[PDB]
Ligand binder design. Structure first.
Ligand SMILES: CCC(=O)N(C)CCOc1ccccc1Oc1cc(Cl)cn2cc(C#N)cc12
Lengths: 548, 407
């Protein structure tokens, strides 16, 4: 236990302690429990008393040579108060500063070494049952932080933090990190000074009642911590194992898409586009799924990347922070963060998978945003950006884009693929260009439709469509007019939908029609699209809606 | 002194908003600020049994200032600061030809805060790379940003201001959060000396006012729609003109275009210069006048919320409308910045300008529909924020079909 001050704890508003009943079980268990509760009462962790306390909690027994006591607190946890959340995310190895030496210390019995607020101990009451319920039970309760109580992690962490304060003061050069039951201590002290300081820290912790391992039990690098490999001068992910199977289950694609994202922080170029596509409308965890041909190519290309290991370096606030971005194709992007040109701090990927119609420049921007957020989280600053786009391309897109967009210091890198605007519509209608009045329409019930046009030069077409929707025909009309026109064409449509897609200037889409429209738009030399209200007899348009 | 009890809306629990991650520079500035505040009693460090949280920021002068986003806590103590101790809003302030905005937020810092309530003002200074749990404080005095602070302090304010109000029975003075809005009709030179009078009076009584916002609310109305004015007209122009006029119909339902529509009966080419009929020009003038007028039925509703919508126009130019019901504009305007500018810096100022107008005119702020990516805004808004309050906002994803409709 410890002379630490207790954190005062209250039960959720308008609630009372747990009064659940203890089901009986093996006398074999009933004995092995009492052999634990006398060695715990001795050590002061559980005082015995039961006269008037009306609450109770269940206790079970299990085995690993020795048995282990177990208490289902879920009913008391449902009535204890909300605490400050313990750390949600964990630090990233690419954000650590190399230290001359690092020691890992794990405190045993962590929760039992910390006292529990007195006025709240009564609600931890439990009972060891008699034989055949013919005798009164052994009444107990806790004086320390019980295992698996809502409050134990956060209170433990704050008690450790306070216990560390007198020592971080006399040692303002050592770096201590807390994480659950461990401490991670680092320093640029010469190894003889360090080992001494470590033993001082252990003695400090021991006066406060926290046991700790000796060098005769202190781990040594490399370190296997939260799925990482932490080396003295480098870090990488613990080895990844991609299974080989011939029947793949929905559960198993999740598990595989997991390991692949995990590896993407350091192994550059991992793709998960086609493999995730698979689990789109997936509910059945067992439903088997065919590896689409394109997915199988990706998985093979991922295996190739994982063949040889790669590593990341640690951070040096002395050097600048650089980020580079490359397009991988099919709405997939990849990036690397580094300070030096042969080793990265880390890697990763961005995929839109949001918004059917999109374009390369908008995507690049979203990507830079993602990197900016992550940089801040890990290092506390934003990185200089190396980007495959030319100032003129970007300036053109952000000056004309309807949203506000911000990009920090960025220099051009002339590494293909490049990011470009592939076409642009005219701001004013073209002279000496034919004017097509396009329209289109379908019937909801029949799903049969038609699209046509009528031009100033008297030209007219109407094409029949099966299995379509008012939206699809409206785009079909425009595609017709681009097909049947010169290198300069004025189109006039009554559909804000189609106007909306084209004005967004997409360069790729999840619909084949829009891709053929994009191909025509690149082929043409001048296209002015233009919009009028429907059923308003504007003229030209009133004549095409009739045909369709 | 004795503390006003503060109770939360029944069945409402304290704020639990997450703290955004911060530049290292900003974190250090906050640690500095908070180490001095802890030293003066204004805030104290707290334990794990306090579960609430409210985000904190750093903004700027060459001095870092701390800014607490109390938006969530404000909604959950609204019965307190709006009905129990609500400060009334004077509808005569929008009329003065000059309004100056004085920051009086440092008054709150002397008055203690109800003990039972302090837990609800917790905030965290975040650490980099999640290395540490964060530094956790609560307030022991009334905080800036909280709407209960000025509600609680109002009585003290009414006493300090009374003398000045007797000598100047014409000057209007209104309190919103941590600012005083002072509107006179004097000549600018007189108004600015009146303002220094009030600054000195407030200082001879203890209230410090930072100084070495002059708003003229006389031109704050719903700007009128503009139909293009052209010497000659073409198929396209008529088409753009018929289109905008058709959209205007949903707002001013007395416009007519049938004559203008016939002007292009056949399927003429887009660049065909077409003259205007006599039955045509009839409307262009008939409709340019039903449109220089105001709407009918457009009344502010104080039980409702104000909505503000902004659109990017090009070349440092932005336009906005403020409404509560679609197409019933309480107000519309045009912000225009004046090379060191940037899209986000302009949107940020625009929001600040619109909010200030909104406070003067109605005494509450609008909720913004912002044309910007959510994560981008959550990253860089604090970089040009100069206000002490923060409006509600959300992000538009669908663009405007025709931008020049509201130009
Ligand atoms: C030279 C670098 C080296 O050997 N490591 C592992 C990175 C340096 O990082 C530390 C700095 C100051 C205290 C401890 C440090 O180590 C850890 C940091 C963190 Cl944040 C988590 N750790 C987990 C383990 C384990 N097992 C070790 C560490």
């Amino acid at each position: 236990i410890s002379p630490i001050e207790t954190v005062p704890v209250k039960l959720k508003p308008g609630m009372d302690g747990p009064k659940v009943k203890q089901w009986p079980l093996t006398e074999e268990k009933i004995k092995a429990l009492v052999e634990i509760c006398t060695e715990m009462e001795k050590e002061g962790k559980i005082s015995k008393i039961g006269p008037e306390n009306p609450y109770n909690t269940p206790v079970f027994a299990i085995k690993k040579t020795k048995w282990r006591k177990l208490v289902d607190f879920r009913e008391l946890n449902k009535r204890t108060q909300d605490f400050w959340e313990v750390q949600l995310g964990i630090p990233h190895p690419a954000g650590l500063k190399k230290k001359k030496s690092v020691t890992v210390l794990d405190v045993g019995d962590a929760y039992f070494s910390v006292p529990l607020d007195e006025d709240f101990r009564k609600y931890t009451a439990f009972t060891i049952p008699s034989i055949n319920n013919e005798t009164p039970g052994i009444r107990y309760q806790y004086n320390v932080l019980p295992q698996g109580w809502k409050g134990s992690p956060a209170i433990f962490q704050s008690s450790m933090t306070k216990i560390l304060e007198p020592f971080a003061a006399q040692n303002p050069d050592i770096v201590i990190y807390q994480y659950m039951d461990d401490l991670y201590v680092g320093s640029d002290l010469e190894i003889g000074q360090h080992r001494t300081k470590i033993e001082e820290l252990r003695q400090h912790l021991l006066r406060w009642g926290l046991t700790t391992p000796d060098k005769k039990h202190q781990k040594e690098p490399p370190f296997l911590w939260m799925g990482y490999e932490l080396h003295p001068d480098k870090w990488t992910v613990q080895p990844i194992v991609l299974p080989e199977k011939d029947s793949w289950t929905v559960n198993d694609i999740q598990k595989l898409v997991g390991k692949l994202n995990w590896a993407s922080q350091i192994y550059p170029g991992i793709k998960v586009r086609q493999l995730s596509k698979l689990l789109r409308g997936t509910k059945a965890l067992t439903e088997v799924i065919p590896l689409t041909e394109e997915a199988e190519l990706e998985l093979a290309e991922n295996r190739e990347i994982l063949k040889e290991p790669v590593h990341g370096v640690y951070y040096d606030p002395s050097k600048d922070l650089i980020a580079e971005i490359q397009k991988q194709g099919q709405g997939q992007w990849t990036y690397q963060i580094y300070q030096e040109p042969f080793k990265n701090l880390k890697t990763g990927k961005y995929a839109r998978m949001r918004g059917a119609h999109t374009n390369d420049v908008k995507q690049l921007t979203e990507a830079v945003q993602k990197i900016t957020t992550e940089s801040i989280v890990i290092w506390g600053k934003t990185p200089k950006f190396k980007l495959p786009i030319q100032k003129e391309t970007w300036e053109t897109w952000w000056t004309e884009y309807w949203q506000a967009t911000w990009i920090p210091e960025w220099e051009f890198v002339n590494t293909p693929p490049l990011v470009k605007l592939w076409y642009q519509l005219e701001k004013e209608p073209i002279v000496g260009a034919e004017t097509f009045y396009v329209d289109g329409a379908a019937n909801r019930e029949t799903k049969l439709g038609k699209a046509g046009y009528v031009t100033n030069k008297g030209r007219q077409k109407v094409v029949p469509l099966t299995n379509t929707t008012n939206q699809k025909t409206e785009l079909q009309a425009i595609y017709l007019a681009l097909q049947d026109s010169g290198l300069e064409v004025n189109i006039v449509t009554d559909s804000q939908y189609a106007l909306g897609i084209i004005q967004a200037q997409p360069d790729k889409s999840e619909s084949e029609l829009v891709n053929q429209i994009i191909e025509q738009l690149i082929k043409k030399e001048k296209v002015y699209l233009a919009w009028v209200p429907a059923h308003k007899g504007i003229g030209g348009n009133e004549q095409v809606d009739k045909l369709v | 002194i004795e503390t006003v009890p503060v109770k939360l809306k029944p069945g409402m629990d304290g704020p639990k908003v997450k703290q955004w991650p911060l530049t290292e520079e900003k974190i250090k500035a906050l640690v500095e600020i908070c180490t001095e505040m802890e030293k003066e009693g204004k805030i104290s460090k707290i334990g794990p049994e306090n579960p609430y949280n409210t985000p904190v920021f750093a903004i700027k002068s060459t001095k870092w200032r701390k800014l607490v986003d109390f938006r969530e806590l404000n909604k959950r103590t609204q019965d307190f600061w709006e009905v129990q101790l609500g400060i009334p809003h004077p509808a005569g302030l929008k009329k003065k030809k000059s309004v100056t905005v004085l920051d009086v937020g440092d008054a709150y810092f002397s008055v203690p805060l109800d003990e039972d309530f302090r837990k609800y003002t917790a905030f965290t200074i975040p650490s980099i790379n999640n290395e540490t749990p964060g530094i956790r404080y609560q307030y022991n005095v009334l905080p800036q940003g909280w709407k209960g602070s000025p509600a609680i302090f109002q009585s003290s304010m009414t006493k300090i201001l009374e003398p000045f109000k007797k000598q100047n029975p014409d000057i209007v003075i209104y309190q919103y959060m941590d600012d005083l809005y002072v509107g006179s009709d004097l000549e600018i030179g007189q108004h600015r000396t009146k303002i220094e009078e009030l600054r000195q009076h407030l200082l001879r009584w203890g209230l410090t006012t930072p100084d070495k916002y002059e708003l003229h609310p006389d031109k704050w109305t719903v700007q009128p729609i503009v139909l293009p004015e052209k010497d000659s007209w073409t198929v396209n122009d008529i088409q753009k003109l018929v289109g905008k006029l058709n959209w205007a119909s949903q707002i001013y339902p007395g416009i007519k275009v049938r004559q203008l529509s016939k002007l292009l009966r056949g399927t003429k080419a887009l660049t065909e210069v077409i003259p205007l009929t006599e039955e045509a020009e009839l409307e262009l003038a008939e409709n340019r006048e039903i449109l220089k007028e105001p709407v009918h039925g457009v009344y502010y509703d104080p039980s409702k919320d104000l909505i503000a919508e902004i659109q990017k126009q090009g070349q440092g130019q932005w336009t906005y409308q403020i409404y509560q019901e679609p197409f019933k504009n309480l107000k519309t305007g045009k912000y225009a910045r004046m090379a060191h500018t940037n899209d986000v810096k302009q949107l940020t100022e625009a929001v600040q300008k619109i909010t200030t107008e909104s406070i003067v005119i109605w005494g509450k702020t609008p909720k913004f529909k912002l044309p910007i990516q959510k994560e981008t805004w959550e990253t860089w808004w604090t970089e040009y924020w100069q206000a002490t309050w923060i409006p509600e906002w959300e992000f538009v994803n669908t663009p405007p079909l025709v931008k020049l409709w509201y130009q």
